[PDB]
Design a protein around this ligand. Structure first.
Ligand SMILES: [Mg+2]
Ligand SMILES: [Mg+2]
Ligand SMILES: [Mg+2]
Ligand SMILES: [Mg+2]
Ligand SMILES: [Mg+2]
Ligand SMILES: [Mg+2]
Ligand SMILES: [Mg+2]
Ligand SMILES: [Mg+2]
Ligand SMILES: [Mg+2]
Ligand SMILES: [Mg+2]
Ligand SMILES: [Mg+2]
Ligand SMILES: [Mg+2]
Ligand SMILES: [Mg+2]
Ligand SMILES: [Mg+2]
Ligand SMILES: [Mg+2]
Ligand SMILES: [Mg+2]
Ligand SMILES: [Mg+2]
Ligand SMILES: [Mg+2]
Ligand SMILES: [Mg+2]
Ligand SMILES: [Mg+2]
Ligand SMILES: [Mg+2]
Ligand SMILES: [Mg+2]
Ligand SMILES: [Mg+2]
Ligand SMILES: [Mg+2]
Ligand SMILES: [Mg+2]
Ligand SMILES: [Mg+2]
Ligand SMILES: [Mg+2]
Ligand SMILES: [Mg+2]
Ligand SMILES: [Mg+2]
Ligand SMILES: [Mg+2]
Ligand SMILES: [Mg+2]
Ligand SMILES: [Mg+2]
Ligand SMILES: [Mg+2]
Ligand SMILES: [Mg+2]
Ligand SMILES: [Mg+2]
Ligand SMILES: [Mg+2]
Ligand SMILES: [Mg+2]
Ligand SMILES: [Mg+2]
Ligand SMILES: [Mg+2]
Ligand SMILES: [Mg+2]
Ligand SMILES: [Mg+2]
Ligand SMILES: [Mg+2]
Ligand SMILES: [Mg+2]
Ligand SMILES: [Mg+2]
Ligand SMILES: [Mg+2]
Ligand SMILES: [Mg+2]
Ligand SMILES: [Mg+2]
Ligand SMILES: [Mg+2]
Ligand SMILES: [Mg+2]
Ligand SMILES: [Mg+2]
Ligand SMILES: [Mg+2]
Ligand SMILES: [Mg+2]
Ligand SMILES: [Mg+2]
Ligand SMILES: [Mg+2]
Ligand SMILES: [Mg+2]
Ligand SMILES: [Mg+2]
Ligand SMILES: [Mg+2]
Ligand SMILES: [Mg+2]
Ligand SMILES: [Mg+2]
Lengths: 129, 60, 394
RNA sequence: UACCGAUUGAGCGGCUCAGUGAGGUCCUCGGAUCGGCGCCGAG
RNA sequence: UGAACUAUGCCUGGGCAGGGCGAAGCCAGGGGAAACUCUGGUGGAGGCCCGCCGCGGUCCUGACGUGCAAAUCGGUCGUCC
RNA sequence: GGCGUGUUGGAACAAGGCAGAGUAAGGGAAGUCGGCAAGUCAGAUCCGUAACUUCGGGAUAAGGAUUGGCUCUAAGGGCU
RNA sequence: GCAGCCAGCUUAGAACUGUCGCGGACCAGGGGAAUCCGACUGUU
RNA sequence: UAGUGACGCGCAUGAAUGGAUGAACGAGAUUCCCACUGUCCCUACCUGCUAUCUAGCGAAACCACAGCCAAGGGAACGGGC
RNA sequence: UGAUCCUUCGAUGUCGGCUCUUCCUAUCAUUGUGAAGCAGAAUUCACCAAGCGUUGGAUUGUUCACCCACUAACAGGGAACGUGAGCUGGGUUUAGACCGUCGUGAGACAGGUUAGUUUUACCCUACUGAUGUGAGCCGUUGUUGCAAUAGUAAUCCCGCUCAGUACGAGAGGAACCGCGGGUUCAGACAUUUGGUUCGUGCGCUUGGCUGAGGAGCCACUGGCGCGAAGCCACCAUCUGCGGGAUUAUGACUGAACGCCUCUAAGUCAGAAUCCCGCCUAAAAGCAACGAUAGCGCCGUCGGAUCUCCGAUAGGCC
RNA sequence: UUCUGGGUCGGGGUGUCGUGCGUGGCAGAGCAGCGCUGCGAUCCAUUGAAAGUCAGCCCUCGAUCCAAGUUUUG
């Protein structure tokens, strides 16, 4: 399915929250699907589901663990058509363990590598690019 | 085949580096020189070697 | 005393020792198994790494997320001028391996091929094969020559041909041709000696050995980097900053017992310039060299069915540190070992190519010819002058 | 039932410092174009 | 037998950029029924602040560690009326 | 004013060191006993400065804006 | 009551101007909220 | 298992063997936050001086003899048997 | 963990971590299986089996714990309780100092706390790479090769499909083939993207210097922006593989033992194992072939002379 | 080691940077003298100019030189 992209969001990366859930930041604590290496930090790209905690936002969200999905990143990744695309910010949306988002709208664009894996996120994306 | 958003040059499907912003505007750049000047908020119509400069000053 | 956390070993022990190859040219250590049902054909070829570029093609991969869509894949240009078969050697099977039975060379051997026989060619009376070439004219020599061919058809099981490259048709400073034995895996020993006897002192193009969208093996010597530390040679983790007496080292090179350093412990030494054999390199395009069709130079070997341009495989300013490819080239997917202008040993696959990726028919849609000597932004000089207009040099 | 209380409090809400800033107006320009017919006009 | 190092004391000498905060004292102007207060300026006190020389010697547990040196070097750093 | 680079020259520019407090995409202490290390800040001008306090301070608190070049304007003196 | 002449060096304001860059090198405090101990400066 | 605020039959706190508090100060010990960064993910590249090679010059530590291993036994972990 | 005190007190550097290699299996996962109180799914027991993998963090100096997540699984260990001329000194374990308890006291604590020099390799091996090497000979020299032996490498996962199917009353819920990707690792590589730039390449710029312009220099690379070539990054890209004998196990024929029986004789299938191939190295191992500077041949049984070095004492039946 | 070949320059290509010096301007906040003239950062044109570009880029298109001689081997 998804081809390998350049990962640029290791653990401990505070990315912006790009939905109307009330959260502003997403402190990535781990990434789904990462087996592991002796010292390698679990990194994530766009379209990867991560476990994140909110650092700034509503009190009912900033002390728990939330499954998030990265939709934008500043690390330029290469697509199969030889295009290196990067965004001006690292963004993510809070979702469930099955892909359903908690919010209803998404500010800013959403990477195509994220909209194709998560159709529930692509429906709330104002611009898929 | 795209055109550079800063220099106006023609970008081929293997070169370049496109850059999408939060406001939904996607910009293609030929190389890092056009990209670095774009992020520096440089005016292409004042950069002497760009297409927008040669069109503004009617050099062609 | 077991290591605290598990971690795989750094590097492979199957590429030991990490020494300089005693042989600059790539060596075929295993030719494809003989199939007598096929016609007599070559199983290897010598090429020269010109440089890399990227192409554009529509992938036909049912089930993939990129099917029916264009991609940009990196390719390597391997200039392969036709090789001249100047000899033939027969091997007899022995309970201690193959053995060179007898070798027969052609009558006329090119000067560039004779340079291989010498270390100081400029001050040597070029007398190599001067008493040997008289066998093809003397009556006693031709009779003994007929017996040597009939002896190879009778006492040999593996027939190889000695062919050299045409260094005269290459941008290299080197004039020494590269000799090589190319095993014939076609049919009967009598058919392979007859085929080799006919092809003596004749050229063999790259299009007659390899075919389109065929996965071949590339043998050659990698690029040398001199003596490199254990952090670059084996990619061991760099020690912390406050480490006294060096942080680019391996901390523990072995336990107390055994009271010796093991061969599997990563040490510092020569990195690069090793013999390697990479397989499954698909040929994306078998180019055609420069030729005069009707008195005009034909250099359209980079035009595709969708470009219809008049550009050659050479980028603007030629390949960096190599030159220009005026001969037949071979476009291989991805990268291959060696520096620029490095002699590459191409070889057919030992395996069966039946996978979806192996038998995939490639149809290039665009070949990039922008200058690799910087950030080239023009495919041809014609569009560089059309886009920029007249300069002050005009 | 109120008060004190670490939490370096906080869901909660108003005017504002400094940034960034859509959108419109205006201005300086731009001149795709069609009516004359190779210059005045609209744009 | 030693205070030519060092510890303390005594006698007679020598020495310590440029800035900062800015106290008493003083001047003038406002507010008040008066008690008196407020503002500006002046003034230049201090085991006061930054900091150069000097005197010290925090960290890097840096360099060095058969050294330049039987204790040194570099940056950093303490103090500097 | 002094001097030949501090008890030697020449040729190379591998590893590994020491130093340049070299630089480094994306992340930003996940490193480590520990932000060790050096990175940030920095001058000046104009604004704005809390908790607490022995009322002295804290304080350059914190947080902002400005800074070039050129051509002018205005004000700040002395003397007969 | 000033006219003439002479003398600097600062300060403020404005236009214009270059790639918004300008203490451009050099020089040159990271900050905040708390705990413990010793008041401080000094000394070892 | 840290820090802070509480709780106190406190193994074994306590009032000039001073208790409690505390602004300012600290190259003191500790915790957190922002900013910041190659500390790390994950290393790479460049420079100087070295190492290296060369001309000249030219030490020292150390040394029973020496110097490939496995097992065995042995003063219970050989290099020699 | 003790017990012992055999080795070491003219010293074997002392906890942990970091780093790195290999090994053991008492197998967590993965491969092939047997068993169930195995319907499916999940799980448990057991067998061949150490090939391969076994993580990122919070707290503590910690081994050990505990928790957060991730994961096929996050199995347990050894190698002087691996590993300090490898590191780091946080801890313990000098001298400074504080507290508590104890002591009349000097002081003690197996209690807590803070600050506290981690020296040397150029020697021999081992290993890593780099020259060279059979001192005897018609050998010298070159090309193309063969090859003993040694190394050895790939790994695991997910999605689609099968299929909402088998199975089940339902709830739930697989698998083989096939397809598309990814994890870890290995070997490369620079077209592209990104990093580096003392090509000191070009622009700009601070202070100063040559009277100024122009052109430049200086400040141990003045600074800044961009930056070629090189080198380089799972931070870009490419590639990673086939057989044989068999293990566990399930069977065939078939006695012993009129039946039965996978075993006794004889057979079959059979794996992340093993061996090999592929791949890397190339030997006091070797082949073919080229060219061989007055130097060398058959002379036919060369004749006649001086020197060394083996044996052997009819046989290649 | 002269049928030639190998260097050094030059040219071209390529790429890098970014529009050189000079000159002109009825561009220039202005200001100072007598519309003229002087001073004046910047601006425009010449001018995608100038500069440098293999030393490990590419191609010769020309120019001008160069050809020796260390040791040893049956
Ligand atoms: Mg670690
Ligand atoms: Mg050639
Ligand atoms: Mg150290
Ligand atoms: Mg290039
Ligand atoms: Mg004294
Ligand atoms: Mg200070
Ligand atoms: Mg000082
Ligand atoms: Mg001093
Ligand atoms: Mg010091
Ligand atoms: Mg200190
Ligand atoms: Mg420290
Ligand atoms: Mg030290
Ligand atoms: Mg040393
Ligand atoms: Mg000198
Ligand atoms: Mg001296
Ligand atoms: Mg180095
Ligand atoms: Mg360094
Ligand atoms: Mg630095
Ligand atoms: Mg970085
Ligand atoms: Mg930590
Ligand atoms: Mg850690
Ligand atoms: Mg520090
Ligand atoms: Mg404060
Ligand atoms: Mg308290
Ligand atoms: Mg004190
Ligand atoms: Mg006190
Ligand atoms: Mg003090
Ligand atoms: Mg913490
Ligand atoms: Mg407490
Ligand atoms: Mg008491
Ligand atoms: Mg009392
Ligand atoms: Mg007491
Ligand atoms: Mg202190
Ligand atoms: Mg011994
Ligand atoms: Mg006894
Ligand atoms: Mg010792
Ligand atoms: Mg001893
Ligand atoms: Mg020892
Ligand atoms: Mg077992
Ligand atoms: Mg059981
Ligand atoms: Mg033990
Ligand atoms: Mg130990
Ligand atoms: Mg050791
Ligand atoms: Mg040590
Ligand atoms: Mg230790
Ligand atoms: Mg300590
Ligand atoms: Mg002590
Ligand atoms: Mg301590
Ligand atoms: Mg200390
Ligand atoms: Mg680049
Ligand atoms: Mg200047
Ligand atoms: Mg000048
Ligand atoms: Mg100086
Ligand atoms: Mg400097
Ligand atoms: Mg740069
Ligand atoms: Mg089999
Ligand atoms: Mg059986
Ligand atoms: Mg069988
Ligand atoms: Mg050259």
């Amino acid at each position: 399915a998804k081809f390998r992209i350049s990962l640029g969001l290791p653990v401990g990366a505070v990315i912006n929250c790009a939905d109307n859930t009330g959260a502003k930041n997403l402190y990535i604590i781990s990434v789904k699907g990462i087996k592991g290496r002796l010292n390698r930090l679990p990194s994530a790209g766009v379209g990867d589901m991560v476990m994140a905690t909110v650092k700034k936002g509503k009190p009912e969200l900033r002390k728990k663990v939330h499954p998030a999905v990265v939709i934008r990143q500043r690390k330029s990744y290469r697509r199969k058509d030889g295009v290196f695309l990067y965004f001006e910010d690292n963004a993510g949306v809070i979702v469930n363990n099955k892909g359903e988002m908690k919010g209803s709208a998404i500010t800013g664009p959403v990477a195509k590598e994220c909209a194709d894996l998560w159709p529930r996120i692509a429906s709330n994306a104002g611009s898929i690019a | 085949v795209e055109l550079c958003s800063f220099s106006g040059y023609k970008i081929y499907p293997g070169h370049g580096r496109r850059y999408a912003r939060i406001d939904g505007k996607v910009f293609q750049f030929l190389n890092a020189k056009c990209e670095s000047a774009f992020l520096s908020k440089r005016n292409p119509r004042q950069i002497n070697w760009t297409v927008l400069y040669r069109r503004k000053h009617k050099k062609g | 005393s077991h290591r605290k956390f598990s971690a795989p070993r750094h590097g492979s022990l199957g590429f030991l020792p990490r020494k300089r190859c005693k042989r600059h040219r790539g060596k075929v250590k295993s030719f494809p198994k003989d199939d007598p049902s096929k016609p007599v054909h070559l199983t290897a070829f010598l090429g020269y790494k010109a440089g890399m570029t990227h192409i554009v093609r529509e992938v036909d991969r049912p089930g993939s997320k990129v099917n029916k869509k264009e991609v940009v894949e990196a390719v390597t240009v391997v200039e392969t001028p036709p090789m001249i078969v100047v000899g033939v050697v027969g091997y007899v099977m022995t309970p201690r391996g193959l053995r060179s039975f007898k070798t027969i060379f052609a009558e006329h051997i090119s000067d560039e091929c004779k340079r291989r026989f010498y270390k100081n060619w400029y001050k040597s009376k070029k007398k190599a094969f001067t008493k040997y070439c008289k066998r093809w004219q003397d009556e006693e020599g031709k009779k003994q020559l007929e017996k040597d061919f009939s002896s190879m058809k009778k006492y040999c099981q593996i027939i190889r041909i000695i062919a050299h490259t045409q260094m005269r048709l290459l941008p290299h400073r080197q004039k020494k041709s590269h000799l090589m034995e190319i095993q014939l895996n076609g049919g009967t020993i009598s058919d392979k000696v007859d085929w080799a006897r006919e092809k003596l002192e004749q050229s063999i193009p790259i299009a007659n050995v390899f075919s389109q969208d065929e996965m071949i093996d590339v043998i050659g010597v990698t690029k040398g980097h001199g003596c490199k530390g254990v952090t670059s040679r084996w990619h061991t983790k760099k020690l912390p900053r406050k480490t006294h007496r060096g942080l680019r080292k391996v901390a523990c090179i072995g336990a107390w017992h055994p009271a010796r350093v093991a061969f599997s412990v990563a040490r510092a030494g020569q990195k690069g310039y090793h013999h390697r054999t990479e397989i499954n390199k698909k040929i994306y395009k078998i180019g055609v060299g420069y030729h005069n069709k009707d008195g005009k130079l034909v250099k359209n070997n980079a035009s595709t069915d969708y470009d219809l341009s008049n550009k050659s495989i050479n980028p603007l300013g030629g390949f960096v540190h190599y030159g220009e490819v005026t001969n037949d080239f071979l476009m291989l997917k991805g990268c291959v070992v060696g520096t620029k202008k490095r002699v590459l040993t191409l070889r057919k696959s030992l395996l069966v190519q039946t996978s979806r990726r192996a038998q995939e028919k490639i149809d290039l849609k665009f070949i990039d010819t922008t200058s690799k000597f910087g950030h080239g932004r023009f495919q041809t000089i014609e569009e560089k002058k059309n886009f920029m207009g007249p300069l002050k040099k005009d």
